């Protein structure tokens, strides 16, 4: 389930703006911590009085010498500056001057807003002429536990009502639904704007207008014959329907929900089918059943009566139609017509989703077989030899098994720049945090680099760069051990936290290489471009003659 | 249903061009309102006579001194200029000169076209040697009302015809279809070119060649035995089939249309099934039914006879096959074969669309579950920690709940530039209309900006820009209240109609920032680029040294 | 099945680094073959002692004069250089100097690692104060052979168990599964990291923790009545389930696997259905069958008893429901309910995949009909005449029949640059290898060109370039014979290994042509751009004044 997170630390001032916005009592705000009380906020009512707009008045000291003039006193104006130091409510009899220079009647009111800690934070200067959380590991497994005993009520109450006319087992489940109402008050909820709402003096009104009327009638045991009024227990299904987004998170669990209801749909219809046999007695199906199983009228057994009924209604809605039991009278046919119509809707709709959910559960093997055919079609098209073939086969089977066919780059760019930067910062933390050049660097830079970086994985035996190739990139080894050869002669091996390529400075163009550079293990690494890195250090002259000095590339190449 | 909108105000002259185009009587046109009667239009017949092409003759005064020469008189030429002032038909005996300079026989005819108001508008100078609307709130709900009583005719007329051989209820529905024909004449229609056609002296011929012959025979009550000729009532189904595009607008209503016809398909076949029992009497199913329900031959009941028949034909076409009732004779089997064949087509086709329509109705929950799996797969791939995790989860669940998974930018660029500009002008009306710089601006500019603007939504607690980041953009706050911090020190809060960034002028490159800039409420806002805004003010030198003077950015940054 | 390929030739040193990394006994490595023993690898433990980082120490001779100073002897230091020549273990009592210049206690240990051949390769200098392959043509067809006799066990063991209470045929299949366990030890397997593992002293532990416990119990014949314990033979199905990725490669073979199991699902249920008739005897279906086939109780035949049972369970799970045989007692209905529920899941799930597999098998004709409609819709839209029509029809039907609707370029760019270059090098081998200019060229260039090349196929009668067109490209003829005309005058015909266009040098801009250039046969060829080729020769000044001299274009154009 989605969460509202939090209302930020300075939302208290946002609500104070709304009460004086409605009141229209002109005011301004200034923070105590920031040196000399800068003008952090001001409404349009104050700006119109003096004449100076927000562009001029914002980031001005709380003294405001622009407001003062010759008519204002030295003794009276000093009491404003000392009021904000001492923290106390003062009514200040003083005049002020506008932009043009006209004196007017005014009266200031300083009101310190003391926070939960103790110390004074803001200065609003007016002028006038037990609890529980809903995404908790207790509540998490509890919402499945309620669902398991909602299935009890839907299945055991029709069997009890229709057929009879487990002593201790009933009341333990019945009392549980009375406890549920108390739980919903104490547990939290998230409105779209209201990002969580603690303290029980708020949620009460949401539960009434939300779902009390329905869920309250569900949980009423009343013992005043005529016990058919226990059909109010079926309403408890509404506790699952409102919380439908909770259970769908587990995709494989939807098969259980769809297939169990398929039994209940048959179950109710089984119970109804039997009730039709009883309420009209003159020849139909029930007397006809007494000849099949040798028990005419005494009479046949109740457990047989339920089975045959559920057996019928399954045969009808599954669209098989056995005919060991089948309708005869007009009321029996009307039922069979109703079950055929709802069954034709059900059998198409409910197993149509099952066909999608089987593909959704095993979506890996779905697209993998289609993608595999494209490689084999590509091989048959161009006629690829076995040495080259196995590199295409291995890379595809590696890359798909690495990522599970997920578009890492495509899904990333759905999000905005700041969150994109945070994702790449999380991915490239191994390099950016644990290196001598990258530690000594500003936080604005590290985000900008992270965008331009590339997490390029390299499996065993690959060839990243070859002899006489133009080094457009610069690499950083996070995992494994990478060799460097030059005609079957091992030059050097480079483990973790290593660098290779050339310093983008020496001669200002992409220089050629010595030879190959292959991986031993799953030598997973990162990669940038010289075109990318140039655009960073231009935007940051401070972090540049510092980068190259501290950074030492462990392999120069020629 | 689609609409033709209107024929524009000056379409009267377009039709006048066609009559003289066919006649080939050379002519020109000039407007009275535009100062001195400029040449607004001219055919090729006039241009060939004089020699001067449209390039030269267009936007020339009505006097036309280029046409005149020495042979033309001062008294005669003056009567042309005074004719267009006075508004009256004059036959002007005068000569004219060509491009080369040769005199010829000519004769001018001025004909003022007086509009519906009164005053003269155009001058065509010839030379020679109760109603109703079909997208109205009355007609809207009425086309559903007709559909409800078309269902009556399809269902009650086979029951009346087949079985019998509600007095007041019949004739009230029968007379309604006679009224429908009168309604179709008075109500409007839209041809592809003919954008609506009012006044009843036009639609009459469309209704005859369209659908009168079919719908006229439908509405004939004739009382001359042999009342089987009331099967003409079934034609009234054609009133729904022609208007099929009307009902599909409501997607959830298609389920009702598909599932109700499924009953009617069974209904007709039920009525036909019974008719087969009657018209051949020697042993079949009808005598066989008299043993099941204890009424052999007296005879069984008519309401039982209908039920069992509808019960059979449902069992056959649903593909269940009960066999409490089943064919025996050759004619009964031929029916069962026909129902199995149409039923196998129906059960696949009609519920195949239902499977698509269930996905189309709940298409939100369809793609949401697939998109949600991509985020969880992305989290499992890179192994994202809970603090960063919840920002990806919240943003995805916010952004999807905001737009309902709609591609706002992709769908916009399907339309052309002028309509794209009109969409963005509608979206950004809050800023463009209600700001001191943007009010004082030409209308051509406001469209060009609107394209380059971006509606970037910002939920609570996000970080749009960070400390030491290059300010490529410039922002405008439409909703909410946005803070600015610099190391947990609140600098200022900015409400609606505010601006921040830097003035693209000071030092001609992207400057760095003070610190963070976070949202409190759903602080929805707009955004452009400095790269974008440069290209506007280059194309508009007038609106530039005016923009920067009047506009004052409420936060400069360093 | 996927393969691990190989562990590269110098993976022996990677494992030696791990043992001393855990031990933390500081060391360095140097190769014998590379001239004067360059420092190929060194851990951080050695670099911290001296002070010099990897950036400085890498590619330094094994002598290391930077380590030496005044305190070190001439006689002792000489024994280090002669030790690596002679190849023998020596404990060297010597001092060394750091970066700053401080003497300390040290002791060197040279250990030559002699490879499988004989000669010395590496020098690690420590300091201190019968088999079988699993992708073989034998094992390939063998894994289908095992699958064919796993079907025997699933089908013949229930018939033997349920009904009876082929002598030589049983034990030949039974003994085979004992041989399978010995095969799995000798045959190879690939772990994700462990790219194949030969020699039987490793796989043994994988087979135990993998699947011995399940497959061992399967292959136990034990003869101690009560022969129902042969149901352990059904476990042999696990040999197919673990190897499921093997059989799916053949897409058309999945139809056999899905449809054969459909028979087995019915088969088991047929055998179970009969067992229900026997184990409760007091009236049910079995006595009821004795009246249909005239054999009451003697009794009816066993082969009839199996058929009728399989006939029933097919009718139930296929969702037909015949009712020549049908349930009566409570236990029989419980079975029928179970078969209806699993059958409703099966009939939707198993034939849902069949619907996809029919489309997957004939996916060519699927997208071909959709793509064909787009061309006909495009022709109906713009109204294309027959001469132009047939060129669109022929090209589409040619191009689709050439590639089978495969995105050659889109699938290629899923792979990285080095493997992309290898694909294009394989495609363009006909030109790059068999030409006088391209033979005399470096291997780094040939990869860079291959990316920029384009395999543009040209069928009979096409027109590649026309008169007065700007020659942006340069062509190379691999197949067929290409004419050049200029107003129905045959200028020249060019066969294989020919060139035409102009030399990118003469006047530094795209020059115009003489006339047409058409194909006779399927004259398949390659193509580049002048924009592309300029960027190559700039990056390679060596291979440029060499390209143009040796290369002679067989047709200049003007």
């Amino acid at each position: 389930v989605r969460r509202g997170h939090v209302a930020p630390q300075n939302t208290f001032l946002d609500t104070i703006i709304r009460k004086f916005e409605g009141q229209s009592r002109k005011f301004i705000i200034a923070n105590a911590r920031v040196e000399n009380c800068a003008v952090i906020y001001c409404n349009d009512g104050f700006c119109e009085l003096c004449g100076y707009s927000r562009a001029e008045v914002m980031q001005r000291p709380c003294t405001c010498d622009f407001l003062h003039g010759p008519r204002t006193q030295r003794r009276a104006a000093a009491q404003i500056a000392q009021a904000l130091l001492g923290a106390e409510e003062r009514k200040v009899e003083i005049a002020f001057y506008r932009k043009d220079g006209s004196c007017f009647l005014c009266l200031v009111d300083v009101v310190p807003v003391k926070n939960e800690d103790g110390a004074v934070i803001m200065f609003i200067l007016n002028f006038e002429v037990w609890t529980i959380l809903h995404y908790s590991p207790f509540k998490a497994v509890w919402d499945w536990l309620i669902l398991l005993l909602v299935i009890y009520t839907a299945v055991f109450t029709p069997y009890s009502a229709a057929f009879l006319l487990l002593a201790v087992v009933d009341l333990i489940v019945d009392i549980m639904f009375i406890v549920d109402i108390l739980i919903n008050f104490r547990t939290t909820y998230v409105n779209a704007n209201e990002e969580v709402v603690s303290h029980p003096g708020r949620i009460a009104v949401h539960y009434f207008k939300g779902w009390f009327l329905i869920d309250m009638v569900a949980a009423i045991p009343f013992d005043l014959l005529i016990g058919l009024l226990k059909t109010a227990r079926l309403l408890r299904l509404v506790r699952v329907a409102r919380k439908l987004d909770r259970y769908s998170e587990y995709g494989a669990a939807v098969l259980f929900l769809l297939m169990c209801t398929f039994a209940l749909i048959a179950h109710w219809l089984a119970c109804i089918w039997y009730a039709i046999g009883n309420m009209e007695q003159p020849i139909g199906w029930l007397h006809n059943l007494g000849d099949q199983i040798g028990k005419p009228y005494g009479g046949p057994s109740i457990k047989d009566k339920y089975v045959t009924a559920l057996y019928f209604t399954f045969s009808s809605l599954t669209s098989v139609g056995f005919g060991n039991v089948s309708p005869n009278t007009n009321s029996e046919k009307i039922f069979s017509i109703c079950v055929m119509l709802i069954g034709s809707l059900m059998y198409a709709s409910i197993f149509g989703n099952v066909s999608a959910i089987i593909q959704r559960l095993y979506s890996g093997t779905a697209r993998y077989h289609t993608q595999m055919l494209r490689v084999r079609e590509f091989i048959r098209f161009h006629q690829i030899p076995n040495p080259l073939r196995q590199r295409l086969e291995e890379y595809f089977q590696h890359a798909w098994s690495y990522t599970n066919g997920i578009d890492m780059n495509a899904v990333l760019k759905g999000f905005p720049e700041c969150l994109q930067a945070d994702i790449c910062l999380h991915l490239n933390r191994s390099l950016l945090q644990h290196c001598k050049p990258f530690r000594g660097a500003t936080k604005g830079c590290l985000r900008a680099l992270a965008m331009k970086f590339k997490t390029t994985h390299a499996p065993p035996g690959d060839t990243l760069v070859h002899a006489g190739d133009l080094l457009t990139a610069l690499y950083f080894i996070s995992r494994g051990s990478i060799e460097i050869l030059r005609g079957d002669v091992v030059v050097a091996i480079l483990g973790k936290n290593d660098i290779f390529g050339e310093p983008l400075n020496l001669y200002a163009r992409p220089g050629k290489s010595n030879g190959d550079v292959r991986a031993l293990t799953y030598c997973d690494l990162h990669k940038i471009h010289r075109d990318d890195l140039l655009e960073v250090l231009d935007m940051y002259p401070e972090f540049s003659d510092h980068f190259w000095s501290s950074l030492e590339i462990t392999f120069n190449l020629r």
Side-chain angles (χ1 to χ4, degrees), chain A residues 1-20 22-24 26-32 34-70 72-73 76-87 89-115 118-129 131-193 196-215 217-244 246-303 305-558:
Chain A
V1 185
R2 69 198 179 79
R3 307 162 193 174
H5 173 270
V6 279
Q9 271 57 37
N10 297 308
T11 49
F12 66 88
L13 67 94
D14 183 39
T15 55
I16 296 160
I17 292 157
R18 292 170 182 180
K19 62 170 279 186
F20 283 108
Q23 191 177 6
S24 82
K26 64 204 175 188
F27 71 105
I28 57 181
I29 314 176
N31 183 231
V34 66
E35 290 189 324
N36 309 320
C37 296
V39 173
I40 71 182
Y41 187 82
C42 53
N43 71 334
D44 294 307
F46 179 74
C47 299
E48 291 159 34
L49 183 64
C50 61
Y52 295 91
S53 64
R54 290 199 186 180
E56 297 170 302
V57 178
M58 291 278 286
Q59 299 192 321
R60 213 80 166 184
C62 188
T63 51
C64 297
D65 295 319
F66 73 93
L67 298 172
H68 293 294
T72 60
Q73 291 84 46
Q79 291 171 307
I80 300 161
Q82 296 188 341
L84 56 76
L85 292 168
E89 194 167 36
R90 298 199 192 180
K91 216 81 171 187
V92 197
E93 180 199 318
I94 48 170
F96 280 115
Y97 280 76
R98 300 189 178 78
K99 189 180 282 179
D100 62 303
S102 56
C103 204
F104 62 98
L105 281 66
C106 191
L107 182 56
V108 194
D109 190 51
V110 183
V111 178
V113 178
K114 295 177 183 175
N115 68 331
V120 175
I121 309 300
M122 301 292 179
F123 296 110
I124 299 159
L125 285 67
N126 199 303
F127 302 97
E128 203 74 50
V129 306
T131 53
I132 308 292
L133 200 65
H134 80 273
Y135 46 94
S136 182
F138 183 78
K139 179 57 187 297
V141 75
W142 190 92
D143 207 56
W144 288 86
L145 189 138
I146 188 178
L147 182 139
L148 197 68
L149 55 77
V150 169
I151 292 162
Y152 168 87
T153 54
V155 175
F156 278 96
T157 65
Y159 177 61
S160 301
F163 295 79
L164 277 60
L165 313 184
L166 37 261
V168 74
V169 179
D170 289 15
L171 195 61
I172 297 165
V173 179
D174 295 0
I175 198 171
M176 180 51 160
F177 292 96
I178 287 79
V179 187
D180 227 77
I181 297 165
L182 276 69
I183 294 156
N184 294 315
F185 290 118
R186 254 57 160 75
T187 53
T188 54
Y189 92 88
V190 175
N191 204 337
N193 301 352
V196 188
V197 57
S198 284
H199 292 84
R202 290 202 175 284
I203 191 165
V205 295
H206 180 77
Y207 198 68
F208 286 125
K209 300 306 303 185
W211 302 108
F212 183 87
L213 181 57
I214 305 304
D215 292 299
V217 173
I220 316 190
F222 43 92
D223 291 50
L224 291 308
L225 224 75
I226 314 172
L228 186 138
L229 301 174
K230 299 192 176 184
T231 51
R233 295 179 181 189
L234 280 60
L235 302 195
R236 295 159 189 181
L237 292 165
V238 175
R239 296 181 199 283
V240 180
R242 70 199 282 196
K243 309 182 189 176
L244 189 60
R246 180 70 215 288
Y247 307 116
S248 301
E249 288 193 330
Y250 280 104
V254 177
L255 291 170
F256 188 81
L257 268 285
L258 266 51
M259 203 65 63
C260 75
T261 51
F262 192 72
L264 270 70
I265 290 154
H267 194 282
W268 281 303
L269 293 166
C271 303
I272 292 161
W273 176 247
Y274 176 53
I276 293 162
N278 299 9
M279 288 195 181
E280 298 192 339
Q281 290 280 10
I283 42 64
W285 81 277
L286 206 71
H287 284 38
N288 184 38
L289 189 133
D291 295 16
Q292 294 176 47
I293 301 165
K295 290 192 177 65
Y297 58 105
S301 55
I302 283 69
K303 198 160 74 70
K305 262 174 267 289
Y306 166 76
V307 166
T308 187
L310 193 141
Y311 162 67
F312 168 66
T313 191
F314 255 93
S315 80
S316 195
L317 74 87
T318 310
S319 83
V320 176
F322 277 111
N324 278 114
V325 52
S326 55
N328 196 11
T329 64
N330 297 323
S331 52
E332 290 167 31
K333 291 167 173 169
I334 290 157
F335 180 85
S336 187
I337 292 284
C338 187
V339 174
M340 283 162 60
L341 208 156
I342 196 174
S344 58
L345 177 54
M346 190 63 63
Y347 193 67
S349 186
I350 204 174
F351 292 112
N353 288 313
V354 171
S355 300
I357 291 283
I358 292 155
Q359 293 173 16
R360 194 173 296 174
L361 181 58
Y362 290 100
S363 189
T365 55
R367 68 174 166 283
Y368 177 77
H369 283 94
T370 60
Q371 291 284 120
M372 180 64 77
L373 286 163
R374 292 181 190 181
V375 176
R376 293 191 173 183
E377 283 167 27
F378 183 80
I379 292 153
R380 286 183 177 181
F381 192 92
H382 298 282
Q383 308 182 331
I384 306 179
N386 286 32
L388 202 146
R389 191 203 210 82
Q390 291 174 344
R391 294 153 202 170
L392 298 169
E393 290 176 0
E394 184 171 20
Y395 184 81
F396 173 71
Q397 292 177 329
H398 172 252
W400 198 93
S401 62
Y402 210 101
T403 60
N404 301 14
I406 297 167
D407 302 329
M408 69 191 294
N409 201 1
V411 173
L412 178 137
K413 295 189 171 174
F415 302 100
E417 288 198 325
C418 294
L419 299 176
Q420 274 185 62
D422 195 49
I423 293 157
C424 299
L425 179 53
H426 170 263
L427 294 166
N428 310 345
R429 67 192 167 182
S430 54
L431 303 176
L432 276 47
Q433 306 182 328
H434 310 277
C435 279
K436 291 183 180 179
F438 294 120
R439 280 196 208 80
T442 55
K443 298 190 173 183
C445 299
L446 295 169
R447 295 183 192 178
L449 278 82
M451 291 286 289
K452 296 166 183 187
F453 261 86
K454 306 177 194 182
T455 56
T456 55
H457 301 109
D462 285 37
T463 53
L464 300 170
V465 189
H466 289 272
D469 294 42
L470 302 175
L471 295 165
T472 55
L474 198 75
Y475 301 86
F476 293 90
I477 306 170
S478 57
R479 293 185 191 178
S481 51
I482 293 169
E483 302 175 309
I484 309 187
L485 281 68
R486 52 195 301 175
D488 311 325
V489 176
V490 177
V491 190
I493 301 81
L494 294 87
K496 301 183 190 185
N497 309 358
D498 279 34
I499 334 175
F500 62 97
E502 262 193 311
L504 203 180
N505 206 305
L506 214 76
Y507 46 90
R509 61 171 63 184
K512 300 185 181 181
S513 64
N514 295 9
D516 294 31
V517 49
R518 305 176 196 171
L520 290 166
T521 63
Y522 288 110
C523 300
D524 300 314
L525 62 91
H526 304 253
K527 186 187 177 182
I528 68 182
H529 263 251
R530 293 196 205 178
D531 301 326
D532 295 28
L533 187 57
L534 277 166
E535 296 185 344
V536 176
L537 277 60
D538 290 13
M539 297 293 98
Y540 301 104
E542 294 187 340
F543 183 66
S544 59
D545 293 16
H546 176 91
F547 179 78
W548 296 118
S549 190
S550 60
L551 183 137
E552 290 191 330
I553 300 166
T554 62
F555 242 79
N556 200 308
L557 297 169
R558 166 55 162 76

